[PDB]
């Protein structure tokens, strides 16, 4: 005998089965590093998919800046990817994408935005996954990162007393012009040109947790200074994204499925008899690779031209940071003898000293790019690597889905679509088996002349009923989705009273989703509800465990008898379901736990969702 | 060790001590300081500003508790609830829950005709008192339906809802009809056009035939399936067009299939499957079948067979200007290829309205006949037959329910054995102070309960059973729950062999002494009741401590003592080759352990 | 117990293949009376200690 567990796949359908051919969602295991060989290979890469050759050295650095913008050359094998942006045509399809909307559309977005921002405390800059430290030269949360930052402007120059985002952004202005910067160390102080590099240092990060692929080997970690900035134009992006019927990117689920289906039923609604329609399910490749900062300055300038210069500065500050920005190298090369009984170990900084030792590979990786090295890093001075203005990317794409002309109409063939961040899905119109190819050559060179590249290897089609989109595979019917998210005790521990709430309300929202039905909720909540009891070292009263916590569990228990009100976190039992997730356990138990056992857990006269007695600060 | 932060004033004003029973506690703390302070601490007064500062959380609850759960069904798309919503409707599956709003009819209709279908399936057990015992099962059928005890020989007529059930047991009334068909599922009519019957043999394997028939002449219908209209012509055994109005795939193809069928067109009426010739039973237990529904049947099974009629039927490549109204072998509402004589649109075709009302005759299979033949309803048309919980309802007459099953079997069985009791002479308690357990071994309700146990190894069962009832009788400690629970093995003779520590049935379920069961559970505290499957039982008697005394209703040979860890851990079969004064641990259920001594 | 090991011993004994350190072993136990019962395996001494007739153990190896 033998096994494929595939036939499955003949007699059903793909929407029912897909979900076995992924893992489990969870923390990856791969451990997908950031080394130098990483850092050096994605640099040049993008050098080269800049198709020019053209420099211009500065005056703050007296370095060269490769400006791969308006000055496209290498035409020959072109269906690789590009970067040199033309801004015609940018500004051609921002333009057509007021029309449709709108004219005082843009204002309008705006307007909201800046009010939006005014009302704004500084303190929200703590809500970050990571950023880089400027002083300790690290990678931290937010709040740890400010507090450095707050605590060595008051050690140099006095305290910040601004308490909002507009005076913070001024004083980083100022902090730019400062010459001497002091701050506590193991204190120190430094110069104009050493903080400045810093603020514009920029670190890669190993983390990528996530369904689908783990393409964010080397994620970005900036630092704090551009963190607002790139807020602001991120809010803004997003005020205008939400208007757009093709973007799924700020929500997904419910409404994008509403979006999915309203879009198919408006095109089938749009054409006629004698028009045949198809699909075709795109991956944007390099997506950071070839998103240019100097595009986006002149979008942002095209869009504000009629509001107030407020927000003309503001909005471009961001862009001409990433502009310039240094690239932090990994932990450098290594050396060894032979038998490699020996092994130097060297920093990035001086492999430029030894580049006669390493070996071809590295060395042909090396010498081109020494000379934008200035002490251990790399002055890119375009691209975008982080994981940034999505939603500006998302705009772009829009606009690049929202152009139609009278070549098209004359031939009677048209286009329209979604596009997520990176990803997307086309629908294209016509009439003939062969006009369909025009409409898809015209689509994809509007696309490539202003970087934004598709994968031939990646990016498939076929007739309109079948095509897939951020992992919800849509057919016919029976939308299948795969973003099944979970929480995480051991990475994230907060208290023994939040994190249960907090799964329960994760499990409700992946139902909501699709993601989930009942008896697999059902499941994933006898897992987590373990998961927890494991973490935080608790279990039952009718279990015969010997572990700390029960000890005295084991002896004052006898001493109540509504054993169904205790708690999760005292030898407590499970009371809610499926139609019981938005409350609480507690809310859920409190009528029920013995008069002594409630008082004694609801005592604000303790040495410490609903505020237990149950917190670890 | 200590990572929890703490006050330090407010820790000694609750005179918290370190190391109470070893465990430190701690300013810094532990975690355990918490249970140490929730289980033996301070007690406060706040619950009434714990539910007004958590108003929303406690009014969300309130809400929730203020529901009235109903029913759910699988299905598909043809402030308060957003709360649930979740856990209200998926795209698969809903449920009918409600808050305020109640209105008990179209449930009425589902139990109408749930009943009907059941009925009249009742009556497809004989070849000739057909009619005779539908009709009885009907008179001998009432409802409480609705809030009106209502007989079932009424509400046939008064309702007006067209469905297979429903007229095929009408017709046997002399009841009005509304023109109306059913073929299966579907639902059809007709619009113009007659013709007569006429007959055609098909193939079977190759080499045998079977006879079919159809109409020669043409005539135009309505189709109709589950959000899907259509129209179309049958013309001499062929379907010659057709439309469609309701866009869904599974629906639209089940539907055409079905119209089809109805026309008899494809080649699989010339031949037929090689899967059909594996049965070529185009017949019930005892009765025929003809080829349309067997035919049908073998759709049931798989898609696939749907996909290969669907082939017979020829398929093409669509031309210019066609692709709005074209078709796809998957219901593809438009595609670069469909099927011959196909059209495709949008909107449901509007169903027409027949007001002349007639009656029709029953046959030997119940088919029921208007005129020139043409079948209106049948039995063949119907689902399986599906158990499904009846309330409100009265059967009375013969075949109204089986209502019997091994777990009923067994509950009357331990009915019985309590009702014996009957606080008298000649009952267990007189036995048990008699001290006569050998009448035990004989009584009557053991006999009855015999042919429900476990054939194979009922020898030792009894064996077990009678030691145990006789350990228990002879010291005079006992317990009357145990007892009873094994009482219906002491009837076979004892055996040697190897015991487990189960009890099996019949029916492949078990129980287990010293333990609780769905089947069968009691508890102290409440020892005047036996629970079987959640069916609380009373006792006819009162007792306080002839059940206390449980220490020999786990075991055969030993007693319970005291509890001690020093003693090893063993098995029910080692017990063989244990001596005396030698006590040993033993799980006696789930995470249960408890020491035993012999004798 | 003491039936088992007389038997084992005539088994052992009239033949000729025998293996002396199972005799050693069970001799102890033919001294009683023969009787019925079941053989669980393993020879029990007064102390919850037993020996095996064929496998090494603790007690005898």
């Known amino acids: 005998m033998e096994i494929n567990p595939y036939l499955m796949f003949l007699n059903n359908d793909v929407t029912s089965l897909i979900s076995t051919t992924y893992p489990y969602t969870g923390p990856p295991p791969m451990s997908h590093g950031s080394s130098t060989k990483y850092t050096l290979e994605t640099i040049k890469r993008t050098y080269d998919y800049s198709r020019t050759s053209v420099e211009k050295t500065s005056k703050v650095f007296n370095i060269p800046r490769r400006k791969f913008c308006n000055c496209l050359e290498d035409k020959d094998e072109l269906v690789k990817p590009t970067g040199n942006v033309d801004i015609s045509s940018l500004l051609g399809l921002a333009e057509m994408m007021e029309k449709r909307m709108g004219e005082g559309f843009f204002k309008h977005c705006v307007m909201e935005a800046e009010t939006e921002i005014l009302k704004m405390h500084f303190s929200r800059l703590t809500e970050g996954r990571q950023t880089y430290d400027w002083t300790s030269e690290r990678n931290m949360p937010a709040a740890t990162a400010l507090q450095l930052t707050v605590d060595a402007i008051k050690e140099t120059e006095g305290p910040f007393k601004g308490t909002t985002m507009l005076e913070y952004c001024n004083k980083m202005i100022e902090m730019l012009d400062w010459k ?44 704090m200074i551009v963190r607002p900035f790139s807020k602001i134009v991120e809010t803004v992006a997003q005020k205008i994204c939400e208007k757009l019927k093709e973007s799924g990117l700020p929500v997904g689920g419910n409404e994008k499925k509403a979006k999915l289906k309203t879009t198919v039923t408006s095109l089938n609604a749009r054409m006629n008899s004698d028009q045949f329609a198809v699909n075709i399910t795109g991956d944007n490749s390099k997506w950071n690779e070839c998103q240019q900062p100097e595009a986006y300055l002149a979008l ?130 016509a009439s003939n088996w062969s006009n369909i190819h025009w409409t898809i050559r015209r689509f994809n060179a509007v696309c490539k002349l202003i970087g934004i590249n598709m994968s031939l290897e990646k990016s498939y089609g076929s007739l309109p009923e079948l095509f897939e989109f951020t992992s919800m595979f849509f057919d016919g019917e029976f939308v299948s989705n795969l973003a099944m998210e979970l929480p995480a005790f051991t990475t994230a521990g907060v208290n023994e009273g939040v994190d249960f709430t907090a799964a329960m309300s994760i499990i409700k929202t ?108 | 060790k200590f990572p929890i932060i703490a006050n330090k004033r407010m820790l000694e004003e609750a005179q918290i001590p370190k190391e109470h029973n070893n465990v430190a506690l701690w300013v810094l703390a532990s975690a355990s300081c918490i249970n140490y302070w929730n289980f033996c601490g301070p007690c406060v007064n706040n619950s009434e500003v714990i539910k007004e500062v958590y108003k929303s959380r406690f009014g969300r609850l309130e809400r929730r508790k203020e529901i009235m759960w109903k029913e759910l069904r699988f299905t598909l798309v043809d402030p308060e609830r957003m709360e649930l919503i979740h856990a209200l409707g998926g795209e698969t599956w809903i449920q009918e829950a409600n808050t305020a709003g109640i209105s008990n009819v179209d449930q009425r209709k589902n139990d109408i005709r749930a009943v009907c279908r059941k009925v009249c399936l009742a009556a497809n057990a004989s070849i000739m008192n057909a009619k005779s015992k539908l009709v009885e099962y009907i008179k001998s059928t009432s409802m409480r339906i609705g809030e009106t005890e209502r007989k079932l020989e009424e509400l046939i007529l008064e309702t007006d809802d067209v469905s297979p059930e429903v007229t095929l047991c009408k017709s046997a009334l002399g009841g009005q009809l509304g023109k109306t068909l059913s073929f299966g599922p579907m639902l059809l009519k007709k619009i113009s056009g007659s013709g007569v019957k006429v007959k055609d ?133 438009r ?41 209106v309803a049948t039995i063949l048309d119907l689902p399986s037959d599906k158990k ?117 049935f019949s029916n492949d379920s078990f129980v287990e002494p010293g333990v609780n069961n769905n089947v069968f559970s009691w508890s102290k505290a409440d020892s005047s009741k036996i629970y079987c499957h959640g069916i609380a039982i009373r006792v006819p008697l009162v007792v306080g401590d002839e059940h206390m005394d449980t220490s020999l209703a786990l075991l055969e040979g030993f007693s319970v003592c005291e509890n001690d860890p020093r003693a090893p851990m063993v098995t029910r079969q080692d017990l063989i080759d244990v001596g005396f004064g030698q006590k040993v641990r033993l799980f006696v259920g789930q995470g249960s352990v408890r020491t035993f001594k012999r004798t």
Request: with cysteine; glycine share 6%; aromatic share 10%.
């Open chain 1, 300 to 429: 942002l300038a095209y869009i504000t031209k009629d509001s107030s210069d407020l927000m003309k500065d503001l909005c471009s500050v961001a862009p001409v940071l990433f502009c310039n920005k240094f690239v932090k190298l990994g932990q450098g090369i290594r050396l060894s003898n032979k038998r490699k009984t020996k092994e130097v170990i060297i920093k990035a900084e001086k492999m430029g000293k030894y580049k006669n030792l390493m070996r071809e590979e590295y060395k042909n990786l090396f010498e081109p790019l020494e000379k934008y090295i200035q002490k251990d890093v790399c002055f890119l001075p375009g691209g975008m690597l982080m994981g940034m203005f999505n939603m500006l990317s998302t705009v772009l794409g829009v606009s690049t889905l929202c152009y139609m002309d009278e070549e098209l109409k004359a031939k009677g063939c048209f286009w329209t679509g979604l596009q997520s961040s990176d990803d997307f899905v086309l629908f294209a119109v």
């Open chain 2, 335 to 375: 595609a670069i290829k469909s099927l011959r004589a196909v059209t495709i649109q949008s909107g449901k075709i509007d169903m027409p309205e027949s007001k002349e009302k007639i009656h029709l005759e029953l046959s030997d299979n119940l088919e029921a006949f208007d005129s020139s033949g043409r079948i």
């Open chain 1, 180 to 223: 001497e910067i002091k701050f506590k160390k193991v204190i120190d102080s430094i110069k104009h040109d050493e903080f400045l590099i810093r603020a514009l240092t920029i670190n890669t990060m190993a983390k990528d947790g996530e369904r689908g692929k783990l393409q964010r080997r080397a994620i970005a970690t900036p630092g």
């Open chain 2, 201 to 333: 043999t098909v193939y079977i394997q190759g080499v045998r035939a079977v006879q079919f028939e159809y109409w020669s002449e043409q005539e135009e219908f309505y189709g109709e399936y589950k959000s899907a209209t259509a129209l179309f012509s049958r013309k001499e055994r062929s379907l010659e067009w057709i439309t469609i109005g309701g866009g869904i795939n599974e629906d639209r193809k089940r539907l055409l299939a079905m119209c089809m069928i109805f026309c008899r067109d494809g080649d699989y009426f010339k031949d037929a499957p090689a899967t059909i010739t594996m049965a070529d039973l185009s017949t019930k237990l005892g009765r025929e079948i003809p080829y349309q529904y067997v035919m049908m049947n073998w759709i049931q099974k798989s898609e696939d067979n749907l996909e290969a009629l669907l082939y017979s039927r020829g398929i093409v490549e669509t031309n210019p200007g066609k692709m709005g109204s074209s078709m796809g072998i998957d219901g593809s509402k």
């Open chain 1, 510 to 617: 992946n139902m909501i989703n699709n993601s989930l039905s009942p008896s697999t909720a059902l499941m994933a909540l006898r897992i987590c509800l373990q998961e927890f009891r494991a973490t935080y070292r608790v279990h039952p009263w009718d279990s015969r465990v010997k572990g700390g916590r029960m000890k005295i569990i084991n002896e004052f228990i006898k001493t109540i008898e509504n054993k169904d009100g205790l708690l999760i976190a005292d030898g407590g039992k499970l009371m809610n379901n499926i139609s019981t997730l938005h409350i609480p356990e507690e809310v859920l138990k409190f009528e029920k736990m013995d008069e002594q056992y409630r008082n004694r857990v609801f005592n604000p006269k303790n040495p410490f969702a609903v505020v237990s007695t149950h917190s670890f600060r």
């Open chain 2, 388 to 504: 499904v919980t009846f309330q409100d309802v009265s059967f009375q007459h013969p075949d109204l329910a089986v209502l019997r099953d091994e777990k009923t079997a067994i509950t009357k069985g331990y009915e019985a054995l309590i009702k014996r009791l009957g606080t008298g002479d000649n009952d267990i308690p007189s036995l048990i102070a008699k001290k006569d357990y050998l009448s035990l071994y004989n009584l009557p309700e053991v006999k009855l309960m015999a042919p429900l146990i476990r054939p194979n190894r009922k020898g030792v069962y009894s064996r077990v059973a009678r030691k145990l009832v006789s350990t228990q009788v002879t010291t005079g400690h006992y317990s009357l729950h145990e007892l009873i629970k094994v009482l219906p093995f002491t009837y076979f003779a004892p055996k040697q062999g190897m015991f487990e520590g189960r009890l099996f």
